[PDB]
Design a protein around this nucleic acid. Structure first.
Ligand code: HMT
Ligand code: CL
Ligand code: CL
Ligand code: CL
Ligand code: CL
Ligand code: K
Ligand code: MG
Ligand code: MG
Ligand code: MG
Ligand code: MG
Ligand code: MG
Ligand code: MG
Ligand code: MG
Ligand code: MG
Ligand code: MG
Ligand code: MG
Ligand code: MG
Ligand code: MG
Ligand code: MG
Ligand code: MG
Ligand code: MG
Ligand code: MG
Ligand code: MG
Ligand code: MG
Ligand code: MG
Ligand code: MG
Ligand code: MG
Ligand code: MG
Ligand code: MG
Ligand code: MG
Ligand code: MG
Ligand code: MG
Ligand code: MG
Ligand code: MG
Ligand code: MG
Ligand code: MG
Ligand code: MG
Ligand code: MG
Ligand code: MG
Ligand code: MG
Ligand code: MG
Ligand code: MG
Ligand code: MG
Ligand code: MG
Ligand code: MG
Ligand code: MG
Ligand code: MG
Ligand code: MG
Ligand code: MG
Ligand code: MG
Ligand code: MG
Ligand code: MG
Ligand code: MG
Ligand code: MG
Ligand code: MG
Ligand code: MG
Ligand code: MG
Ligand code: NA
Ligand code: NA
Ligand code: NA
Ligand code: NA
Ligand code: NA
Ligand code: NA
Ligand code: NA
Ligand code: NA
Ligand code: NA
Ligand code: NA
Ligand code: NA
Ligand code: NA
Ligand code: NA
Ligand code: NA
Ligand code: NA
Ligand code: NA
Ligand code: NA
Ligand code: NA
Ligand code: NA
Ligand code: NA
Ligand code: NA
Ligand code: NA
Ligand code: NA
Ligand code: SR
Ligand code: SR
Ligand code: SR
Ligand code: SR
Ligand code: SR
Ligand code: SR
Ligand code: SR
Ligand code: SR
Ligand code: SR
Ligand code: SR
Ligand code: SR
Ligand code: SR
Ligand code: SR
Ligand code: SR
Ligand code: SR
Ligand code: SR
Ligand code: SR
Ligand code: SR
Ligand code: SR
Ligand code: SR
Ligand code: SR
Ligand code: SR
Ligand code: SR
Ligand code: SR
Ligand code: SR
Ligand code: SR
Ligand code: SR
Ligand code: SR
Ligand code: SR
Ligand code: SR
Ligand code: SR
Ligand code: SR
Ligand code: SR
Ligand code: SR
Ligand code: SR
Ligand code: SR
Ligand code: SR
Ligand code: SR
Ligand code: SR
Ligand code: SR
Ligand code: SR
Ligand code: SR
Ligand code: SR
Ligand code: SR
Ligand code: SR
Ligand code: SR
Ligand code: SR
Ligand code: SR
Ligand code: SR
Ligand code: SR
Ligand code: SR
Ligand code: SR
Ligand code: SR
Length: 237
RNA sequence: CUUCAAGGGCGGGGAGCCAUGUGGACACGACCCGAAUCCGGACGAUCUACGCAUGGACAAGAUGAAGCGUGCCGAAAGGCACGUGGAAGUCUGUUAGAGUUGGUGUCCUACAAUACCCUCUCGUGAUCUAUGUGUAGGGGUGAAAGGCCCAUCGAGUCCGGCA
RNA sequence: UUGAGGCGCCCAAAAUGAUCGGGACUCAAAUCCACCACCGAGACCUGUCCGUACCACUCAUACUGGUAAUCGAGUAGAUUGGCGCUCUAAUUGGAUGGAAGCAGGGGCGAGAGCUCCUGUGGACCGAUUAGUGACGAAAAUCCUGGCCAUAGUAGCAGCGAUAGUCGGGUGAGAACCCCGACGGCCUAAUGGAUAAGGGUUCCUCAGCACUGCUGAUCAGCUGAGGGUUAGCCGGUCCUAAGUCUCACCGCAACUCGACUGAGACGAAAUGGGAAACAGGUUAAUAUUCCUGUGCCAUCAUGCAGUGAAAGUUGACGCCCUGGGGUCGAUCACGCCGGGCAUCGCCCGGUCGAACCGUCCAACUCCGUGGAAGCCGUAAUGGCAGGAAGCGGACGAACGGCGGCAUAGGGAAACGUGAUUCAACCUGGGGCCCAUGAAAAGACGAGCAUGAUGUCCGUACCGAGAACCGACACAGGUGUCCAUGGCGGCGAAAGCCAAGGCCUGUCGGGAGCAACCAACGUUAGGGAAUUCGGCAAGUUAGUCCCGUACCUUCGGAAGAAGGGAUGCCUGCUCCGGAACGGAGCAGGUCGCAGUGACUCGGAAGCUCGGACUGUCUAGUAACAACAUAGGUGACCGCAAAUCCGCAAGGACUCGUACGGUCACUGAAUCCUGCCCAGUGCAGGUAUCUGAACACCUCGUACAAGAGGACGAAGGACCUGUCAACGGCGGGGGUCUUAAGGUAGCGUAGUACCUUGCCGCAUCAGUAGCGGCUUGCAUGAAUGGAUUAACCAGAGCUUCACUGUCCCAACGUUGGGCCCGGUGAACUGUACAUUCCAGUGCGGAGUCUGGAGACACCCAGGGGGAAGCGAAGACCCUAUGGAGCUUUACUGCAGGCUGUCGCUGAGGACUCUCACUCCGGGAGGAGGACACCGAUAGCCGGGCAGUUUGACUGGGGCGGUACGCGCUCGAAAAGAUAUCGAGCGCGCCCUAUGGUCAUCUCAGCCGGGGACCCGGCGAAGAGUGCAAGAGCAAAAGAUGACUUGACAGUGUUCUUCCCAACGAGGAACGCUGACGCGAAAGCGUGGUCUAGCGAACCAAUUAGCCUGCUUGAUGCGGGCAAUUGAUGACAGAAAAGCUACCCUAGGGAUAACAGAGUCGUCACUCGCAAGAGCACAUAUCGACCGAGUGGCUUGCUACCUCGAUGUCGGUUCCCUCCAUCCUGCCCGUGCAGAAGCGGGCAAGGGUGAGGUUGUUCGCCUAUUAAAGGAGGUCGUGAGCUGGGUUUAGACCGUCGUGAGACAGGUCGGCUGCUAUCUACUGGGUGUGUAGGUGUCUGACAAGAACGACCGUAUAGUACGAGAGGAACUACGGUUGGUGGCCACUGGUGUACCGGUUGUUCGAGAGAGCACGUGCCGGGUAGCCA
């Protein structure tokens, strides 16, 4: 047959690539040595084309104009502090050890000094729970208990732009516009609507899948379609 | 040679070797032409598909969302009337432009290897379009028709394998 | 009276024209019995010759003689002698006193071929012998070239751009080259400027051989010259998506490859960007040259300045909108010029840049001020955190103003104000799950003078002739002019300027016929047409009134329906005003006032998909795809998913409100039961589970055998269906888990089926509602439902109409004739055919007849199974390809163990490799992971293949695919079919072998066990089919025994004849045995079925052998046994294709023809039976005999290098088995009306509703509304609804691709007529200069068919009811021929009205598609 759509994806052609040249900033945490004497004023609130949520333009004490991942309730004029001895206020970045338990946090690092990996999408947050000399247990937006190094930096507050998922797209045109700003080929043609040559579920006199949809983990690319290694399917039971 | 034995098999009382012509066999293109393949290396996104960059295009009219206003009523929440406002993959539209339903009309050694006419659809948007740019052959591209990738596609084209 | 024979008669119906081959024949030219004489082959006889064979003579196969009654045809094929071509060689010749070749002619040879003569030609050419070979053509849809017919034919018409005409000029020549006039065409283009692309096409001169749809003096053609001028227009410079180079790394390697660095490249209309304007000039350039004026950058000098880099700019989305404002357009008035001349109106002009200077609205801000309700807007809005007002800072135009300018330009005047205002300037608002470039550069940052400003592009076209499309192609191809006038909402129509053009480039002629393309108008009827209103038409602009069901409250909706609409006079209202808008009163014209143009037909029910959107470039626009919405799955990021061999990469400037992978498909109400199978996932005592290492055996080592341990995986258990899917049969459970819940339901799913009832219609296989047992509905394989939307499928109503009844007339372009230009398709030959026949069964050519003087013109297409295409259907090939899967075999990939990297102290700690994070310090992880290697599991993701044969085509079924018997089988042997009957793939240690003893079925008689006797050739028994064999046995009993033995043959069979293996049998020998007294019997079972190659393994006994040699291990071999290939003389092996492809086949199916005639239709014989009695008025069984060739079936003869499929239509002919009509017979015939039958094919046999239908059902009419044949007549006539391509849906089936003799929506119709045929028209020839009139052999007709009514007559008849006829009349209908006084149509003759626009008004005209529209309409032509 012919390579399926998921295989054409990896080749990284124009149709599948993100419009990186139209993107603003790689929202990472600032590099401080030790001292905390790094603070800044918020100059503007901009729209980030990569995440459909707002991003705050901050100017630091040493004269560095950088775009930071904006939490909720951060405006122009507000002072934000980045460092170890930083104030426990919304919009400030300090390591998980210094942040008190039961406080909603965002833009959490995986390995200390990476710049933030977890809890970055609109309105989400990570919950800091347990403290130790060795480990800081953070509850990620999926409900998972992630055991992290207490030296991993994070910004206090929930991410801005909450409730985005609440309003429906209503029409295909609105989806079109959102998708033109992402690294995704859209619209989606069902495999069941294709020819046998194009997809494992293609073919037939009527539209139905060939074999069952739940595919093994060990399945090769070109066959791994439908429900990938499903523990279960359906709603009931 | 096989063989207690017996019986079988093959060979035996000197004709061959070489040359030339010719009959026939086998491998090779194998009397000659005749077809759909398969494989290799190359050349194509001047057509077309999808994406991207930078530009361009859309007479006129209709309908009248929110919001705002004034007035009346109400304790209030609000409600009603009128106006304002000018939303919309909104409507009419041969505006430009795009498309192509029917005539199974005209043409069918054509004007034309996909044309002509009338009719018909869309026309502020998932819109149309120029140029630049990207993706390449079991690979692209595909709102999926096995569509499209230069009159070539259920695996392009060229040459080679190859007689 | 009865029997028999001969010939004939009845029985006896078919489609273009009858037949014995024809004519025709009757005491025969028939038939039968005899007879006589003839004709008639290549046979037979005979003369001569030839070949071949043999004989004699001979060296001879050279002569000569002889023999053939017992030699003389031949495809495939075998054998043999010879002819011709090229060049070589030897020998030997010819030729300028004329070689070869060619043309015509003479002679020889059976022939291949040889040779001569004459003419031409003008330099080479032979013979014999031996060689050599790119050596012989009628053919291959053969190749290349040339050429004829086709043919003076098609095209040079068709397009909303119908274009020309009269004079004249030039010239050898003029319809189309030029001038004028008149008449037209183009208005987002047919005008103006350009991008690409072209490349000299540009200008001039000279030309016409080429090219130009005719011609040409012209030209984009031919030839020669000439032509493109830049500091300030582009390029150049900058950076965009992105590209390349180098370095690095990978790769076997590179011209290959991702990342990361650095560098460069990447924008000519249309991104950014230092600077130019006005005029003049050329045959051709021009912001480039020239004149005038101006501007920018750099550098130099001088003055100023020490500021200098922060900041600003470059620099930005979509929608709405205010303000400023120029060109343009228009209005007012004035000046200059022109036009018109009943008025006094109409047109043109009235100019003047860059630049320099200056002005500033908006925005923002400052001071003042002090609003508690005011300020403000088109709108939002603003404010004690300070509103209005006042003053001020900053600050715009491509704009105003002044200079520029006693510059330029104009014949002249050489204006002034205004409105609406593109450009340009500047603000306010709204939207985003969408956030709308970058860099160079500039500003910031003065002035003078001077210098420098190079390089590249620059012509022309930019398209119905300069580009792409082979073309001077009706196609395709980007940008700017979007503000010219009237018109109107308008960048709409229509008309007209500026500008362009008569080159969408052949003309002339005929009231100009048929026929065709586009089109106008048609009385009465009004969808009767058709699958279907396809096509056409209707409606229409604007205002007022008014507006249903339903609904998601948005909508439906312009629902529907009704009214109005012009001009003129005078006005009112809104607004600053418009040359803006809304109204009022009076007057007034037409058939018509959106007067043309522009411009919706409307309503209802049902199906589908929610909607906008997408798609098969080129037969599918749809119900298919997408969509929001719903849902499930995977993943915490060193992730999930995906790309790469690797180095590496996408997702990702991303992080679960994410994004990957799938399903469903808006909303609303909902979404039942099932985890048995399959899938996925989790778990797992126990079981199974590879390699490494480890242990045992083995080997001085090794191979090898075994054990222990045991990962993932599997077994097993569990979870899961919005996972694949399933939701039945039986009874008052069974399979296999459950057993169909809401709903919906004859469905796009229902076979039966046109289901039943209802609605609607005269009539409704349709449609809608209800019912509904559902062949075979049903819940995200989503069920139901649904407002809105739709070039989607079906149905109904109103309106409308040439779709129809039923056709007519007209208009334009063709067609026809003439000048010019000038193809192609097609061609074995012959060809004037027709009716029959025959033939490979579908003949212009054969046979028999008939007809036929030749040639030409026009026509519509009957035939040439017409032309076009090596059939796409079907089968076949040990063909191809795409696709599928639990086909065969493999390959990636994932998971998992093990080894290496890899280190220290059956679980654990550490840090030093290694990995990751961190800029770094350092942090996390860590001997793991990554990577290299190997092992097990999964593994259509990918690759290569296979998937047999037989067969009344193929498939399905079956196996006549290996064996045995009877019959078929025709009395030797052999013998086929999917022939008839039926078996074998073993079984038996005795059921084998021998010997002894003995005789069985069945029956009878005496005491179904047992006993005695008798009869009893065989019917018993003998393992199993069938046929056969057997009685002191081959059977039974008993006893003994293992010959069912080893070895090796002969022969037959397998395979008749007649080659072929395994297998089998008969018959021997050698050895050893058993039994018997012995002869003898035993090579399994009485005979014929019970069977298997090579390779490899195991096994039996002895021996041979392994690379210098000895020992040991382990191998190689001779002989044979066992293990299976049943497709049985042996491959290891599944499907789909409608996406298809190739080779072929009429070796083979579908349609049609042909044969047959069971079937079908029709008839006949007999006549049981009933018909109150009565066979025969009428009906009529059984049985028997036939005819036809409409149905069906059978066959496989014809065609697969194609004979176009159903139904319908249109037009022609025919048959009779007659439905009506005419004439008859019978009657259970009173009459009337019927029933049945006979002759008879002249004429007729019609309109409609459902359905694609044929068929059929139904309605109303009718004299009747018959059937059938003509390739199921008729696609070079039509239609295209059905069948039967490619798209899609539903049901059923399938794991799946996909399938269906199921349903459903969509889905293409080629060609210029050579021959023949006919309809009409001519020219010639024959009869044999003329005019006029006739004759009539033949030929055609349907020229007529039928009905109603009145008188007869309320009569005959009949109780009555009821109710005729002859005849004479009147009319109607169908058909036919002709004609136009009458009625009607047309009438782009003509006359009138009138809308828009242009010619100034008037008058009078053009255009609005070949009449703008409306009204009337003569002649003619018509019904
Ligand atoms: C299955 O039906 C078809 O395949 C029709 C067609 O394909 C038509 C071809 C038309 C062309 C292309 C030749 O013009 C065809 O070749 O038909 C053959 C054909 O083509 C010449 C003619 C045949 C041959 C016998 C006569 N018959 C007439 C037409 C026909 C009709 C059929 C038929 C076969 C024939 C053949 O099956 C049933 O319907
Ligand atoms: Cl999304
Ligand atoms: Cl001879
Ligand atoms: Cl230029
Ligand atoms: Cl404003
Ligand atoms: K055929
Ligand atoms: Mg970031
Ligand atoms: Mg995109
Ligand atoms: Mg989809
Ligand atoms: Mg499909
Ligand atoms: Mg398909
Ligand atoms: Mg597949
Ligand atoms: Mg479906
Ligand atoms: Mg489905
Ligand atoms: Mg292109
Ligand atoms: Mg309003
Ligand atoms: Mg000689
Ligand atoms: Mg030759
Ligand atoms: Mg031949
Ligand atoms: Mg002709
Ligand atoms: Mg004209
Ligand atoms: Mg000239
Ligand atoms: Mg032309
Ligand atoms: Mg009429
Ligand atoms: Mg009809
Ligand atoms: Mg129509
Ligand atoms: Mg006023
Ligand atoms: Mg229906
Ligand atoms: Mg749709
Ligand atoms: Mg198409
Ligand atoms: Mg469509
Ligand atoms: Mg979805
Ligand atoms: Mg769908
Ligand atoms: Mg019904
Ligand atoms: Mg369910
Ligand atoms: Mg063929
Ligand atoms: Mg086929
Ligand atoms: Mg194949
Ligand atoms: Mg790293
Ligand atoms: Mg495969
Ligand atoms: Mg076969
Ligand atoms: Mg015999
Ligand atoms: Mg084998
Ligand atoms: Mg063995
Ligand atoms: Mg065999
Ligand atoms: Mg055999
Ligand atoms: Mg074929
Ligand atoms: Mg045949
Ligand atoms: Mg034909
Ligand atoms: Mg008769
Ligand atoms: Mg007749
Ligand atoms: Mg027919
Ligand atoms: Mg025909
Ligand atoms: Mg045809
Ligand atoms: Mg034709
Ligand atoms: Mg149909
Ligand atoms: Mg159909
Ligand atoms: Na092949
Ligand atoms: Na392209
Ligand atoms: Na409102
Ligand atoms: Na069209
Ligand atoms: Na549409
Ligand atoms: Na390919
Ligand atoms: Na022969
Ligand atoms: Na001309
Ligand atoms: Na100025
Ligand atoms: Na639309
Ligand atoms: Na199950
Ligand atoms: Na079902
Ligand atoms: Na008409
Ligand atoms: Na014809
Ligand atoms: Na294929
Ligand atoms: Na096979
Ligand atoms: Na034998
Ligand atoms: Na018969
Ligand atoms: Na027909
Ligand atoms: Na008759
Ligand atoms: Na036919
Ligand atoms: Na046709
Ligand atoms: Na037909
Ligand atoms: Sr980083
Ligand atoms: Sr990051
Ligand atoms: Sr499928
Ligand atoms: Sr459930
Ligand atoms: Sr391109
Ligand atoms: Sr508009
Ligand atoms: Sr619209
Ligand atoms: Sr059509
Ligand atoms: Sr035409
Ligand atoms: Sr065509
Ligand atoms: Sr038409
Ligand atoms: Sr529209
Ligand atoms: Sr080749
Ligand atoms: Sr002979
Ligand atoms: Sr002979
Ligand atoms: Sr030859
Ligand atoms: Sr010719
Ligand atoms: Sr013309
Ligand atoms: Sr131009
Ligand atoms: Sr000439
Ligand atoms: Sr010229
Ligand atoms: Sr450049
Ligand atoms: Sr530019
Ligand atoms: Sr204005
Ligand atoms: Sr054009
Ligand atoms: Sr076109
Ligand atoms: Sr003009
Ligand atoms: Sr011409
Ligand atoms: Sr008229
Ligand atoms: Sr109708
Ligand atoms: Sr009808
Ligand atoms: Sr009306
Ligand atoms: Sr729904
Ligand atoms: Sr299960
Ligand atoms: Sr039920
Ligand atoms: Sr003709
Ligand atoms: Sr073909
Ligand atoms: Sr058959
Ligand atoms: Sr025997
Ligand atoms: Sr199968
Ligand atoms: Sr299909
Ligand atoms: Sr008769
Ligand atoms: Sr009669
Ligand atoms: Sr029929
Ligand atoms: Sr029927
Ligand atoms: Sr007929
Ligand atoms: Sr049917
Ligand atoms: Sr069917
Ligand atoms: Sr059709
Ligand atoms: Sr004569
Ligand atoms: Sr009467
Ligand atoms: Sr009476
Ligand atoms: Sr006219």
């Amino acid at each position: 047959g012919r390579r399926i759509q998921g295989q054409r994806r990896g080749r990284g052609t124009s149709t599948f690539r993100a419009p990186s040249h139209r993107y603003k900033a790689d929202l990472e945490h600032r590099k401080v040595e030790d001292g905390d004497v790094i603070a800044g004023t918020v100059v503007d609130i901009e729209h980030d084309p990569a995440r459909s949520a707002p991003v705050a333009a901050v100017e630091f004490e040493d004269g560095d104009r950088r775009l930071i991942l904006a939490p909720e309730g951060v405006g122009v004029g507000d002072e934000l502090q980045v460092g170890v001895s930083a104030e426990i206020a919304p919009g400030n970045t300090l390591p998980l050890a210094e942040i008190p338990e039961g406080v909603p946090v965002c833009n959490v690092e995986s390995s200390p000094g990476d710049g933030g990996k977890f809890a970055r999408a609109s309105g989400v947050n990570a919950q800091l729970l347990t403290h130790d000399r060795n480990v800081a247990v953070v509850k990620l937006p999926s409900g998972e208990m992630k055991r992290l190094d207490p030296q991993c930096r994070a910004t206090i507050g929930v991410v801005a732009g909450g409730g985005r998922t609440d309003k429906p797209f209503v029409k295909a045109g609105n989806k079109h516009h959102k998708m033109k700003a992402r690294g995704t080929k859209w619209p989606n043609v069902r495999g069941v609507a294709m020819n046998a040559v194009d997809h494992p579920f293609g073919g037939g006199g009527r539209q139905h899948p060939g074999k069952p949809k739940s595919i093994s983990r060990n399945a090769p690319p070109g066959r791994k379609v439908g429900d990938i290694a499903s523990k279960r399917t359906g709603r009931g039971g």
